[PDB]
């Protein structure tokens, strides 16, 4: 225990030496983004209860959403139509995911099972291809590496990597003290980051199964995590009501986004395609569009009666989908 | 304007909408309760009609209730409890026999009652192991005054009447514990939710009837607030 304290001070001292200049000072002379105004271009209705999760498809036209109703339903964003309606066995689901190939979707809940559904089949029905079991806590996030492999973060302080065809964990990631709330895959997919209630975010190598780095700058739990499009940085959303940008290579937080007006927690975070705009969803029923480089709020998306649980920016970057507990998820452009 | 295949897709969406609405109407019939008790509570025993998350469905007087019991989760329940923020009532169970753990039960009740997400929902409190409490009080080896100093300075309310065949000091202990819980319940004073205490033995003929008439009371109060009568 004594040796760990000395090593911990070395890491903090090493980080202080590298931090020669603040990113705010580095980016003092850049054009302000200005005031951005985005009006809701759609409102997808049909969920009869609170919406917990939503994920965009790769084609950017289709998305899947999960709700307390106990049904997973896929939308056609452009035409508002419902492509599918999938009845879930368990009503409680905190996460859903869309495969990169669009062939499968995943759902995770309090039933300690991540269920993979085969959308494209003969006989014209969505059928559960597998039930992934082995976690001892609720599944907070699931993300597909490819059509075969899926990573799931759980409330048992342990993230896992599954081979869907085998159905058994091929790797397991154990470094967290609190329940894991979020998981964000990198653009290259070779590594990822996870978020937990211990107020720490850790970088895990997928193949090796080891924690490369850990970042701690949050007072409270972190609910959502999103990699920067470059893949060399990420941002985290906490109940402290501060959104912090973290750097993989530098190994220190570069900047924190906070306003005295908002003391309410952050439910979701996403990065614009260029990475300049950080869209943070809040329990105060309004998502705030943050200029990441300068950390000045440039716009507000205020059209939700209840809390925004979900936020997702399309792969093309055209549209922003925000789900919420009022059972309406609105696509903004 | 609209292609034939897109028109057929719209028809499919409309059929899906009708199926979703029918399923929601079916779901609206059932009233959903959250059963929680940390340990030694008898949560499996409180309701005998029906026998990661364990779901028990029982129906009394032509109304069907669904009861959720979760065992896996640890002491920190903040993140999964927010899912159960629409339940009609939360059934809390405590064991009055164990005085050492009773303060922990009171702290748990305070945390759940004062939870921000669960402000609206009421609580049905079952004080369990009534026969064990009576036996311990009769024996007198355990002193509630020791675990709870305030018990020595207490007077049973004259308005309340003990049931026949119950001892006076025993009833004093029962009403002391009930008042201790009800004080935490009434401290907030919001009035949107109420704690309803019930004393339950290890085996009781019908606690489902108690849950049923209590749920009638909660729905009645909600309707009175809705119509602006109260």
């Amino acid at each position: 225990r004594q040796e760990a304290e000395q090593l911990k001070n070395q890491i903090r001292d090493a980080r202080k030496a590298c931090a020669d200049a603040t990113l705010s000072q580095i980016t003092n002379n850049i054009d302000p983004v200005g005031r951005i105004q985005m009006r809701t271009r759609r409102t997808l209705r049909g969920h009869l209860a609170k919406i917990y999760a939503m994920h965009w498809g790769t084609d950017s036209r289709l998305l899947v959403s999960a709700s307390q109703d106990g049904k997973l339903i896929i939308w056609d964003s452009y035409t508002t139509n419902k492509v599918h309606a999938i009845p879930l066995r368990s009503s409680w689901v905190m996460t859903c995911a869309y495969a990169p190939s669009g062939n499968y979707v995943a759902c995770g809940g309090l039933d300690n099972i991540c269920s993979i559904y085969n959308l494209k089949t003969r006989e014209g029905n969505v059928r559960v291809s597998r039930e992934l079991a082995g976690h001892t806590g609720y599944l907070s996030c699931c993300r597909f590496l490819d059509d075969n492999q899926i990573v799931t973060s759980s409330g048992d302080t342990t993230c896992a990597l599954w081979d869907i065809e085998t159905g058994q964990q091929t790797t397991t990631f154990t470094g967290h003290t609190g329940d894991v709330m979020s998981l964000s895959l990198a653009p290259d997919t070779r590594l990822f980051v996870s978020g937990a209630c211990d107020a720490s975010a850790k970088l895990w190598d997928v193949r090796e199964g080891m924690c490369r780095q850990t970042f701690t700058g949050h007072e409270s739990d972190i609910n959502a995590i999103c990699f920067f499009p470059n893949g060399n940085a990420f941002a985290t959303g906490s109940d402290d009501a501060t959104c912090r940008l973290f750097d993989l290579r530098a190994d220190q937080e570069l900047m924190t986004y906070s306003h005295d007006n908002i003391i309410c927690g952050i439910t979701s975070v996403s990065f614009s395609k260029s990475g300049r705009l950080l869209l943070a969803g809040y329990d105060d029923f309004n998502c705030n569009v943050w200029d990441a480089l300068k950390a000045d709020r440039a716009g507000v998306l205020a059209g939700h009666d209840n809390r925004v649980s979900c936020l997702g920016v399309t792969d093309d970057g055209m549209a922003v989908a925000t789900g919420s507990w009022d059972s309406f998820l609105k696509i903004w452009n | 304007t609209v292609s034939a295949e897109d028109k057929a897709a719209a028809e499919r969406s409309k059929m899906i909408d009708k199926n979703l609405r029918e399923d929601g109407e079916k779901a609206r019939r059932t009233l959903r309760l959250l059963l929680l008790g940390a340990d030694n509570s008898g949560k499996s025993t409180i309701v005998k009609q029906m026998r990661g998350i364990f779901e028990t469905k029982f129906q009394v007087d032509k109304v069907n209730f669904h009861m959720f019991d979760v065992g896996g989760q640890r002491d920190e329940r903040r993140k999964w409890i927010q899912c159960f923020n629409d339940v009609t009532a939360i059934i809390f169970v405590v064991d009055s026999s164990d005085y050492n753990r009773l303060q922990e039960a009171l702290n748990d009740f305070k945390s759940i009652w004062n939870n921000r997400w669960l402000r609206t929902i009421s609580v049905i409190l079952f004080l369990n192991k009534q026969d064990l409490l009576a036996e311990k009080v009769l024996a007198g080896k355990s002193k509630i005054e020791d675990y709870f100093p305030e018990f020595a300075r207490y007077t049973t309310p004259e308005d309340a009447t003990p049931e026949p065949g119950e001892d006076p000091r025993v009833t004093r202990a029962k009403y002391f514990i009930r008042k201790e819980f009800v004080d935490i319940s009434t401290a907030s004073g919001d009035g949107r939710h109420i704690c309803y205490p019930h004393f339950t033995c290890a085996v009781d003929t019908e606690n489902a009837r108690r849950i049923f008439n209590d749920c009638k009371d909660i729905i009645l109060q909600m309707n009175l607030r809705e119509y602006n009568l109260v």
Partner: single-chain antibody
Amino acid sequence: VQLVESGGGLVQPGGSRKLSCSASGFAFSSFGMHVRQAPEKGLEWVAYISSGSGTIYYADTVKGRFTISRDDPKNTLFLQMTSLRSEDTAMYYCVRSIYYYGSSPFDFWGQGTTLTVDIVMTQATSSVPVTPGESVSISCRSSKSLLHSNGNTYLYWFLQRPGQSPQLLIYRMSNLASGVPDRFSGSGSGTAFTLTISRLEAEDVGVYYCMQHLEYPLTFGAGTKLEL
């Protein structure tokens, strides 16, 4: 998945008959159902029934004399025929189809029962000689552009082997139906389309039909036969 067709046979002109196609192995409620082929001529679309029987269309040739009905719990589909005419002799096929984003309608076709008693799509050639292993191109023209404003172009390529019902090769002029080899490719311009078969082999020989789905009625081209 199977569609077995029952009923047919000789009928005196002016009589009535009812054909039944029974579905097994797939969710019959989800699939909107349909197509006849005369003994010596290409296919022609007869009727269409949506999911839940909400919408019905008939071809003008058979409108007012035919009646299409589906029994969802039994899964059977019926075509009730009245005032049978000499032109109505054909091989009647029961075809499934599902319409959502990314769907592949007309994917499966039934066996067929013999009965004895508008956008114009043209195929330039009725017959085309082929050799094994050599690229073959079949072209089908359209009177009107099949490209809708949304970007989809509704051309379908169907292949009928000898002694076999038609099967879907390409849907919407580019997308390749599942279970079909990657040799078949669909290239298409506005009002002019082509199907290219590369490295042709035996069992890829048959009549290739081009269909439009921009608007009802659905018109089939006469189709270009391949002969080795």
